[PDB]
Each structure stands twice: as C-alpha cells, then as structure tokens.
C-alpha cells in the first residue's frame, strides 16, 4: 500500500532555503516559507497541505 496524495496537496521540493529561524510570539521558531504563496509558517500546525 502506498497512500495517494490527496487532491488539494501542493508539491514542494525540500531545500535548505525553505526553513529558517524566525521570531514568532517570543520564540525563535523554525519557520517554513511556502514557495508558492511566499507565506511564512513558524508553527508546524496550520501549514498548507
């Protein structure tokens, strides 16, 4: 069994550049920046599929 990727998901090649240190609510969280939207996501929760 290989789970299919669900219809809404977006392909993203891993690259060191996608992850960074950043301030977020008095913490230096490992922010991830989505390559399409450009949006930064300090929490692992709430990230785009």
């Amino acid at each position: 069994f290989v789970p299919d990727v669900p219809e809404g998901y977006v392909a993203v090649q891993y690259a060191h550049r996608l992850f960074s240190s950043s301030l977020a609510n008095k913490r230096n969280r490992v922010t991830y920046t989505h390559p399409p939207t450009g949006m930064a996501y300090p929490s692992p929760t709430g990230r785009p599929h």
């Binding site: 977020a24 609510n25 008095k26 913490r27 929490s43 929760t45």
Partner: protein
Amino acid sequence: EAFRWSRYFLDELQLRRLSVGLRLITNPRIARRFNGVRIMYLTDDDPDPD
C-alpha cells in the same frame, strides 16, 4: 408591636449590616467560581488568562 414581625430574630444592626454584606456577596470581583470549559486542541502562543 414587637410581635408583629420577628425580623428573622435578628437585631436591627445585623439587618443594616446584612444589606451591605449582600452588596459584597454579589460583587462581580468576588465571583471567581467559574462554570464551563472549552476543550479545544490549540497551540498556546501568547497566552492570556482571558
């Protein structure tokens, strides 16, 4: 005349004070017993009690 109402068998001054006490007992600041909780799975960035 004393017999017409027992006045709860309390002294006059006790009733007079009792009114003030009732004003204390219903003050919002005292009312720190809370009812109900919302269970929800959420990150606690920037907590506030409120």
